[PDB]
Amino acid sequence: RIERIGAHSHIRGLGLDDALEPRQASQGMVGQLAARRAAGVVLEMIREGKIAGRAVLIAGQPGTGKTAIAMGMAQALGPDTPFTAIAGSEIFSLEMSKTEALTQAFRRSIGVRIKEETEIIEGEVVEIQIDRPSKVGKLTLKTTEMETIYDLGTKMIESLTKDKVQAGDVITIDKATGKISKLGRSFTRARDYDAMGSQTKFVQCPDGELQKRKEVVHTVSLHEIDVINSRTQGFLALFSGDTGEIKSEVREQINAKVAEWREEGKAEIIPGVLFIDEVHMLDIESFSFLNRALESDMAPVLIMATNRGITRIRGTSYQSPHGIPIDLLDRLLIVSTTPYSEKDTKQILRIRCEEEDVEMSEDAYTVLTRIGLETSLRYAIQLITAASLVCRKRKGTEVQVDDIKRVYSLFLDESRSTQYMKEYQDA
Amino acid sequence: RRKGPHCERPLTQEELLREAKITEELNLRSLETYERLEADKKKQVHKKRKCP
Numbered sequence: 331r332i333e334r335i336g337a338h339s340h341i342r343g344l345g346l347d348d349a350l351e352p353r354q355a356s357q358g359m360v361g362q363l364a365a366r367r368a369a370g371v372v373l374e375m376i377r378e379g380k381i382a383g384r385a386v387l388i389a390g391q392p393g394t395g396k397t398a399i400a401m402g403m404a405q406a407l408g409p410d411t412p413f414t415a416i417a418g419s420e421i422f423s424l425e426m427s428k429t430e431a432l433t434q435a436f437r438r439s440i441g442v443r444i445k446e447e448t449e450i451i452e453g454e455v456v457e458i459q460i461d462r463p464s465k466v467g468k469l470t471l472k473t474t475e476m477e478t479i480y481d482l483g484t485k486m487i488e489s490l491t492k493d494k495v496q497a498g499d500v501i502t503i504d505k506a507t508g509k510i511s512k513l514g515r516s517f518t519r520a521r522d523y524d525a526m527g528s529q530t531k532f533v534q535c536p537d538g539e540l541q542k543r544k545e546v547v548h549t550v551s552l553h554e555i556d557v558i559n560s561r562t563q564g565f566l567a568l569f570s571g572d573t574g575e576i577k578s579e580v581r582e583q584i585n586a587k588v589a590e591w592r593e594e595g596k597a598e599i600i601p602g603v604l605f606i607d608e609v610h611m612l613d614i615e616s617f618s619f620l621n622r623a624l625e626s627d628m629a630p631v632l633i634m635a636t637n638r639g640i641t642r643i644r645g646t647s648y649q650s651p652h653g654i655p656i657d658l659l660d661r662l663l664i665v666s667t668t669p670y671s672e673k674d675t676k677q678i679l680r681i682r683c684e685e686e687d688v689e690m691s692e693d694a695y696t697v698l699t700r701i702g703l704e705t706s707l708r709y710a711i712q713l714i715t716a717a718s719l720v721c722r723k724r725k726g727t728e729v730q731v732d733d734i735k736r737v738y739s740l741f742l743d744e745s746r747s748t749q750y751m752k753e754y755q756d757a
Numbered sequence: 758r759r760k761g762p763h764c765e766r767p768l769t770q771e772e773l774l775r776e777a778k779i780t781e782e783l784n785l786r787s788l789e790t791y792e793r794l795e796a797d798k799k800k801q802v803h804k805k806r807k808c809p
């Protein structure tokens with residue numbers, strides 16, 4: 331319910347048409363037509379998912395919507411498709427190597443979905459009789475269409491008593507494994523309150539047939555598979571990130587078995603996306619490993635954000651564009667994001683201030699676009715929230731130009747901070 | 758040479774015997790139907806509880 335609106339919470343997806351034609355200001359995104367169209371093409375290739383290990387590099391100026399396009403792709407791709415966002419500095423771990431962390435990041439965006447047809451029994455328990463001498467009993471299950479009786483076995487009675495199911499309770503019984511799951515209390519579940527009862531949350535009885543055959547789906551990532559198969563401690567996915575799976579049969583066996591599963595139709599594949607933000611943090615070893623890690627058939631697609639230009643590669647003294655060696659840069663398809671014009675900055679500010687629920691005047695928009703064209707669009711955006719607070723403090727309705735000017739004089743951007751740093755300031 | 762055997766009841770009437778067995782057919786059918794229905798309505802194969 332309460333998940334605040336972050337910097338990228340305004341974009342709900344790429345504003346594209348059926349033919350991947352980017353609209354001006356649809357679905358949160360504004361301008362940046364060429365890069366948005368490239369993002370849409372790669373997103374369509376992703377949703378297709380018959381090619382593995384493809385890399386894209388979204389380069390551009392700082393604050394031009396690269397991470398914005400990434401979050402838009404994530405949203406347009408939605409669930410049921412792994413999307414893993416990672417900063418370049420997150421792989422520098424102390425307990426696992428950089429190559430192992432990259433293998434984890436890759437295998438974490440590859441989904442394996444086992445589809446099963448386990449039949450169950452869903453109904454509202456009417457009576458649960460049981461006589462202890464091995465104890466034996468019966469159960470009366472009712473649905474809105476029919477009622478039936480069942481003779482309960484030893485382990486059936488054991489599980490029913492352990493789960494403590496009673497009459498009026500709506501439950502589901504996995505006939506294959508005998509797993510019980512109570513979904514709620516039916517109107518009949520009324521206990522004729524005359525004792526210490528504090529629950530009266532009723533619900534409609536189950537409809538349809540008594541013994542129906544529904545379909546379950548178990549979706550887990552190759553990362554989780556190899557983690558739970560590494561050692562008897564099958565909880566490292568939640569327990570802790572202590573890892574280091576040897577590349578011996580364990581991972582090769584995961585791959586071989588997933589191949590057989592795909593062949594026999596148990597669970598085939600669902601590729602994913604890996605958004606590496608600020609990839610310039612990766613080391614020369616990281617790039618050299620990626621060079622061949624992108625060549626694996628189980629390699630999901632990756633999109634790497636870039637602000638740097640002609641700069642040295644980390645871990646060495648080689649000057650290379652994007653801070654990435656040409657060896658890896660050759661596999662990538664480079665998309666350049668252009669700076670936003672006046673009408674693009676203004677529309678972005680408008681959408682942001684309408685998303686964060688702040689009404690600005692027509693002159694407020696003008697002065698804010700001026701400030702955002704003279705300074706960073708990020709500073710202009712951050713000015714909106716600060717300007718709304720002075721208005722609320724003075725009991726206003728919509729942000730005026732005087733509030734934005736007060737906020738501009740009160741807070742400093744990087745340029746004015748540097749120009750004010752005229753003293754030693756403990757260099 | 759004191760004792761001796763005896764025998765009597767030499768009677769068997771063809772048509773009257775046919776009638777008698779055609780009548781016994783009634784008892785036979787009654788027994789069959791009674792056994793069948795009683796079995797089907799009483800056995801209803803199942804088990805009972807223990808006496809501890």
Ligand SMILES: Nc1ncnc2c1ncn2[C@@H]1O[C@H](COP(=O)(O)OP(=O)(O)O)[C@@H](O)[C@H]1O
Pocket residue numbers: 337338340358359360361362390391392393394395396397398399677678681682707708711
């Ligand atoms: N085309 C656009 N439409 C709407 N908002 C945008 C657009 N481009 C950038 N923004 C906004 O600008 C802010 C910062 O820009 P960002 O997307 O982070 O660019 P960069 O990643 O280059 O800094 C974000 O909060 C984003 O909402």
